[PDB]
Amino acid sequence: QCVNLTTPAYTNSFTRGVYYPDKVFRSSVLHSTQDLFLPFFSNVTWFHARFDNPVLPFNDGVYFASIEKSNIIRGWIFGTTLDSKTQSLLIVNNATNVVIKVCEFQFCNDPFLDVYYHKNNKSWMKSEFRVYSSANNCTFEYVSQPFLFKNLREFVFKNIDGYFKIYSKHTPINLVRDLPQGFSALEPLVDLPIGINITRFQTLLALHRGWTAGAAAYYVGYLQPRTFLLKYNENGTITDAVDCALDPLSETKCTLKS
Amino acid sequence: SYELTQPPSVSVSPGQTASITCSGDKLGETYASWYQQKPGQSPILVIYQDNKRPSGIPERFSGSNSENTATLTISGTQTMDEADYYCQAWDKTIAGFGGGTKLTV
Amino acid sequence: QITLKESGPTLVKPTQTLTLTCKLSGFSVNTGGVGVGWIRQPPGKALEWLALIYWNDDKLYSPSLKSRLTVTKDTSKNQVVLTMTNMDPVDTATYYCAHVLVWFGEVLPDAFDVWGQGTMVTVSS
Ligand SMILES: *[C@@H]1O[C@H](CO)[C@@H](O[C@@H]2O[C@H](CO)[C@@H](O[C@@H]3O[C@H](CO)[C@@H](O)[C@H](O)[C@@H]3O)[C@H](O)[C@H]2NC(C)=O)[C@H](O)[C@H]1NC(C)=O
Ligand SMILES: *[C@@H]1O[C@H](CO)[C@@H](O)[C@H](O)[C@H]1NC(C)=O
Ligand SMILES: *[C@@H]1O[C@H](CO)[C@@H](O)[C@H](O)[C@H]1NC(C)=O
Ligand SMILES: *[C@@H]1O[C@H](CO)[C@@H](O)[C@H](O)[C@H]1NC(C)=O
Ligand SMILES: *[C@@H]1O[C@H](CO)[C@@H](O)[C@H](O)[C@H]1NC(C)=O
Ligand SMILES: *[C@@H]1O[C@H](CO)[C@@H](O)[C@H](O)[C@H]1NC(C)=O
Ligand SMILES: *[C@@H]1O[C@H](CO)[C@@H](O)[C@H](O)[C@H]1NC(C)=O
């Protein structure tokens, strides 16, 4: 079922990629924490979906964001060799549910979902699934509700002590082709007790027929071990954050807890 | 319901091509489908999404949809193709079947 | 394979309520993308669509009959039940249930691939 159809830019992520570091409720407080966060005012790699779906490094954790209207980006593949030799993690959002599996998958040279559209540009139907040819020795399976003006979706992927932890946020965006300037904290989505080695990942697109895609783009950044001062409002929501390693002004604010 | 008109009957000689039309208001915007019903039996899907056949349906059956008119064509019509043919179209979740065309051979 | 089986009363009186049950196999009513519709066919006449239910309990009804039609599904028995009230002699027909192909995103009905055998219901005194 594999189709051998073959032939970046950077943006400024001002104050984004911050997530609730734990599950402890806090309010009306400035709290200092140390964890893996996206550095402020960093160079985030910008890809377009003609589509770009290369294999990217995972490093110590991945900040992933997408802007789209037609729901082209459906999921991700995480692993090492990304073939039948090792276990790998497949996260895909289908028409009704999100399917998360860990198996010895044999992925296609260029994996994707094969869909077609109605005469209108809102409805769609599946034709086939062209991501892998096999899925042997499955160890983990989880099914839940889908992860899903353009739609902005942000995810943070961490892998600590065997747990693949996903944080997320979904907001509307009124920009044409870039990330918003402002602050928004990501919330815990799911904790997956998997126990596998991840060094690389790939983005899965829904393509249609040879095969093409509509207008969409996504951004990839990386997390670093940095100190942040998080501002919790009266309702316990983080409304601001200071990157203590950004500049001398932030250092002063973090030192004085203000 | 959705308004959808068919001819009352079609009559061809064996070996000829039968053509059954189906006229609506918005068939140029939505998808049409066709069913074949024999006497005493439930209808069988022959064409869906304008021109796609289900597995098991003979290559004799084809069709199209343009200018708000949909058609079903039977090439090399056999005497075993005698049946009442119906067209269907959905207007944004509003169903509608045609009156049905009696095809004789 | 996929199959559907209609059952229920084959005779009701005027002003009585008819209940028809569609017993299905090969798929579950709780499975995404699944829908089951009801269609009737009076003797010598064309098919008329009545209603269909989606796996997510969303429902579509024919505007002209909506006021008399209720559709529910049994999530344990894999059965779809149609209730049609206040029937008149003119409502005599063969009733069918069938599988519905469904478009996603903006959810729409497409076509009926697998049909049941159908059951004849007469309305008379
Ligand atoms: C999107 O993915 C989900 C999860 O894979 C799909 O739901 C699953 O669909 C399969 C059928 O394709 C169901 O299998 C059935 O399992 C029962 C036993 O529980 C068995 O008796 C049946 O014969 C059949 O094997 C599966 O249970 C179901 N899982 C869940 C959680 O619903 C979903 O259908 C996919 N969406 C689309 C549009 O395909
Ligand atoms: C796709 O091309 C690669 C070479 O880049 C080859 O190794 C692989 O076997 C091909 N797969 C198919 C299905 O043609
Ligand atoms: C981002 O890249 C630009 C060059 O395109 C460079 O001038 C700038 O200093 C870089 N900023 C960071 C934080 O790396
Ligand atoms: C869907 O998009 C195509 C390309 O822009 C357009 O030609 C077509 O008319 C659109 N469909 C509808 C119902 O407008
Ligand atoms: C499961 O792994 C073993 C090796 O430990 C392998 O021999 C077996 O074939 C695998 N199962 C499947 C279905 O491939
Ligand atoms: C993951 O695999 C890479 C080689 O692909 C290896 O260098 C690294 O140490 C492995 N990590 C773990 C936790 O096994
Ligand atoms: C806290 O929640 C209340 C509603 O319960 C809202 O009126 C108030 O503005 C919120 N405070 C902040 C800082 O958002």
3-state secondary structure of C52: strand
* Domain annotation covers residue A170: yes
C106 contact residues in A (CB cutoff 8 A): 118, 120, 122-123
Neighbours of C15 (CB within 10 A): 10
**Amino acid letter for position C80:** V
Q: Which residues pair with A241 in a beta bridge?
A: A230
* Beta strands across the sheet bearing B32-37: B9-11, B101-104, B83-89, B32-37, B44-47
- Contact between C116 and C97 under an 8 Å Cβ cutoff? The reply is yes
d(CA B72, CA B86): 10
* Domain annotation covers residue A222: yes
- Characterize the bridge pairing of strands A88-93 and A73-79: antiparallel
* Domain annotation covers residue A2: no
**Amino acid letter for position B62:** S
* Domain annotation covers residue A37: yes
Resolution in A: 3.6
- State the distance from the centre of ligand 3 to the C-alpha of A127, rounded, in angstroms: 43
What domains lie within chain C, and their CATH numbers?
3-111 (2.60.40.10)
Experiment type: cryo-EM
* Domain annotation covers residue A68: yes
C33 contact residues in A (CB cutoff 8 A): 95-96
d(CA A146, CA A134): 24
- Ligand 3 atom 7 nearest Cα: A43
Place of tokens 């950004």: A246
Domain count, chain A: 1
d(CA B29, CA B97): 17
- State the distance from the centre of ligand 2 to the C-alpha of C67, rounded, in angstroms: 59
Q: What is the DSSP string of A114-138?
A: EEEE-SSSS-EEEEEEEEEEEEEEE
A114 contact residues in C (CB cutoff 8 A): none
Place of tokens 């734990």: A22
- State the distance from the centre of ligand 2 to the C-alpha of A81, rounded, in angstroms: 16
Residue numbers preceding breaks in chain C (C to N > 2.5 A): none
C109 contact residues in A (CB cutoff 8 A): none
- Ligand 2 atom 1 nearest Cα: A4
Exposure string for A33-45, b = 16+ CB within 10 A, e = fewer: eebbbbbbebebe
* Domain annotation covers residue A15: yes
Residue numbers preceding breaks in chain A (C to N > 2.5 A): 7, 49, 148, 209
* Domain annotation covers residue A80: yes
**Residue ranges making up the domain that contains A74:** 9-256
* Domain annotation covers residue A67: yes
- Contact between A49 and A204 under an 8 Å Cβ cutoff? The reply is no
Question: Closest ligand to A3 CA?
Answer: 2
Q: What is the dihedral of CA A106, A191, A159, A250, to 10 degrees?
A: 140
What domains lie within chain B, and their CATH numbers?
9-104 (2.60.40.10)
Residue B68 C-alpha, separation from nearest chain A C-alpha, in angstroms: 13
Specify the CATH number for the domain of residue A223.
2.60.120.960
- Ligand 5 atom 1 nearest Cα: A137
**Per-residue CA distances from C96 to A77, B46, C74, C109 (Å):** 44, 18, 18, 17
Task: Name, in order, each residue with C-beta under 8 angstroms of A160's C-beta and a sequence gap of 6 or more.
Answer: none
A12 lines ligand 7 (CB under 6 A): no
Q: Does C122 touch chain A (CB under 8 A)?
A: no
Place of tokens 């995972």: A58
- State the distance from the centre of ligand 1 to the C-alpha of A190, rounded, in angstroms: 21
Query: What residue ranges line ligand 5, CB within 6 angstroms?
Result: A 136-137
Question: Closest ligand to A105 CA?
Answer: 5
CA nearest neighbour of A202 among A88, A124, A97: A88
